[PDB]
């Protein structure tokens, strides 16, 4: 049984702890799981092998001479700018939205945090997994999303999103 404390844990959860949660907190450039050049929260650089091309995009990013080291405060404005492009992406999509609009809040979080990974191109293809979320085939989706070569490549940055499809909880996100 839910204690009070576990039935508040819905509410500290939302779109930007999900993803703070699945991309990590770096200010040092890195490489991914896939060894993209990335920063901050999940922000990828670029797909360039030369580190000089990802420093270069993050002082564009940030707006100053960063030699590949940001703040927290830079972070999390760069992760908002993130999420914002990644909702707008869905919103402006004749595919992703009306799937979009589907969802209850917790699958909607799922979706964004989906396109916020792969971009929106990479989303809209989905074409089985879209449908199967329009008819609330919760399993189904999950099985299918869990073929992607977006999960088989880096499962343990995936996984969660797609507990969530499955789940439309935060379960996945509890006890880390």
Known sequence: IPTTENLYFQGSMNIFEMLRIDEGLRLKIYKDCEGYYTIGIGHLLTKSPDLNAAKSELDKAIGRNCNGVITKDEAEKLFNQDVDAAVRGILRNAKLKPVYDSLD????????????????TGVAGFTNVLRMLQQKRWDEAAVNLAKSRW????????????????????????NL
């Open 151 to 174: 999960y088989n490549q880096c499962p343990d940055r995936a996984k969660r999103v797609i507990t969530t499809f499955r789940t439309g909880t935060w379960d996945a996100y509890k």
């Open 105 to 120: 809040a917790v699958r909607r979080c799922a979706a964004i945090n989906h396109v916020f990974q792969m971009g929106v």
